[PDB]
Paper text:
Proper operation of the pivotal CME cargo adaptor AP2 requires membrane-localized Fer/Cip4 homology domain-only proteins (FCHO). The AP2 complex, composed of α, β2, μ2, and σ2 subunits, is pivotal to mammalian CCV formation, and its deletion is embryonically lethal in mice. FCHO1 and FCHO2 are similar in overall domain arrangement —folded N-terminal acidic phospholipid-binding homodimerization F-BAR domains and C-terminal folded μ-homology domains (μHD) separated by a ~300-residue, low-complexity intrinsically disordered protein linker, which has been suggested to participate in AP2 activation, although how it does so is undetermined. We dissect the network of interactions between the FCHO interdomain linker and AP2, which concentrates, orients, tethers, and partially destabilizes closed AP2 at the plasma membrane.
To confirm the identity of the extra, Cμ2-proximal electron density as the N terminus of FCHO2 linker, chimeras of Cμ2 alone with N1+N2 attached to the C terminus via 30-residue unstructured synthetic glycine-, serine-, and alanine-rich flexible linkers were then created, crystallized, and their structures solved at resolutions varying from 2.0 to 2.6 Å by MR using an unliganded version of Cμ2 as a search model. The Y pocket is variously filled by parts of the tags of an adjacent Cμ2 molecule. Muniscin family conserved side chains make key interactions with Cμ2 residues 167 to 170, which form the BR3 PtdIns(4,5)P2-binding site. The N1 interaction occurs mainly via complementary charged interactions between Asp318, Glu320, and Glu321 and the Cμ2 BR3 PtdIns(4,5)P2-binding site containing Lys167, Tyr168, and Arg169. Isothermal titration calorimetry (ITC) measurements showed the binding of FCHO2-N1+N2 to have a KD of ~25 μM. Mutation of key binding residues in Cμ2 (E320A+E321A+K326A) reduced binding fivefold, and mutating Tyr323 to serine rendered it unmeasurably weak. The FCHO linker does not directly interact with the Y or Ø cargo motif binding pockets in any structure but does pass close by before its main chain changes direction at FCHO2 Pro327. The weak density that follows on from N1 adopts a range of conformations forming crystal packing contacts, which we believe to be nonphysiological (mutations FCHO2 Y340S and E336A+F339S have little effect on N1-N2 binding). Whereas N1+N2 binds Cμ2 with a KD of around 25 μM, N1 alone (i.e., deletion of N2) reduces binding by ~5-fold, demonstrating that N2 plays a role in binding AP2. In support of this, mutating four of BR4’s basic residues to alanines (BR4-) caused substantial reduction in binding of GST·FCHO2 linker to Cμ2: The lower level of binding reduction of Serinc3 loop results from binding Cμ2 only at BR4 and not to BR3 (43), whereas in FCHO2, N1 can still bind to BR3 even when the BR4:N2 interaction is disrupted.
Residue numbers in the entry: 153 to 225, 239 to 435, 477 to 488, 492 to 501
Write the structure that this text describes.
């Protein structure tokens, strides 16, 4: 008369020398924008990734800024949500609670979709004034829209060029830029850029008009960037833990949180053991922490 629960995704007797967990919030923000700035199309697809280095059978509870925020007065509006099997869905439907017993090591806790209240990290404003059939004048400004303390990185703006181009001279003060004729685009790279900033690029584009009477469609300005926050607005409120056999809780745990927002289609038009103890697995930016 005693039933033995056996979780298919977590063995028993897991031991870590130090109880700790990792949370990676990985979002791709996509956009189609008009030259004037009208949002024609936008969505974020995100996923919370978790690396559990916890001992025993910990009973966790993931807390974010959902529509429980609407009860206590920034948030994330989740259109669609899919969970790992470990997540009790019963509780999520009754109380919006993401409770679970995590697998050992890395697992994807949830993926999601978002279309409203997206923090669009960048706006591109393009001008193209034709000045004769000889020349084209191109002015492209990029506005960063996030906290000034924060830095976007690995930025690349691909401004398309028309096929009938004999050559182009370009100038920018921030970053570096090359006209890659093979590509049919001037490619503009900036290493870092803080929030609430401007930056301009000007390109005098000389034309060779052989064809006449036909102006064909051209690709839009596409941007790549990496941003240290969730463009959906996702903020991790807590990761509560309770393991009643070993009597330890989140107060006895180190939680490591990271946000990696990355551009998607952002377009604008013109474990092992040893002695019982499990071992953490291991190209990434190095930071000296006391407990690392």
């Amino acid at each position: 008369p005693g039933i033995h629960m056996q979780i298919g995704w977590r063995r028993e007797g897991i031991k870590y020398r130090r109880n700790e967990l990792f949370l990676d919030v990985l979002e791709s923000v996509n956009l189609l924008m008009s030259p004037q700035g009208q949002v024609l199309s936008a969505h974020v697809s995100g996923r919370v990734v978790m690396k559990s280095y916890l001992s025993g059978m910990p009973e966790c509870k993931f807390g974010m800024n959902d529509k429980i925020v609407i009860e206590k007065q920034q948030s994330i509006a989740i259109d669609d949500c899919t969970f790992h099997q470990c997540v009790r869905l019963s509780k999520f439907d009754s109380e919006r609670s993401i409770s679970f017993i995590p697998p050992d090591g890395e697992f994807e806790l949830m993926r999601y979709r978002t279309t409203k209240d997206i923090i669009l990290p960048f706006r591109v404003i393009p001008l193209v004034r034709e000045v004769g059939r000889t020349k084209l004048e191109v002015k492209v400004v990029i506005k960063s829209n996030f906290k000034p303390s924060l830095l976007a990185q690995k930025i690349e703006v691909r401004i398309p060029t028309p096929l009938n181009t004999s050559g182009v001279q370009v100038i920018c003060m921030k970053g570096k830029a090359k006209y890659k004729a093979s590509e049919n685009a001037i490619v503009w790279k900036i290493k870092r850029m803080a929030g609430m900033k401007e930056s301009q690029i000007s390109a005098e584009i000389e034309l060779l008009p052989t064809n006449d009477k036909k102006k064909w469609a051209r690709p839009p300005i596409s941007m790549n960037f990496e941003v240290p926050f969730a463009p959906s607005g996702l903020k991790v409120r807590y990761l509560k833990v309770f393991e009643p056999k070993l009597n330890y809780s989140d107060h006895d745990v180190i939680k490591w949180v990271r946000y990696i927002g990355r551009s998607g289609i952002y377009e604008t038009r013109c474990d092992v053991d040893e002695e019982g103890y499990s071992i953490k697995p291991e190209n990434d930016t190095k930071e000296n922490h006391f407990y690392s």
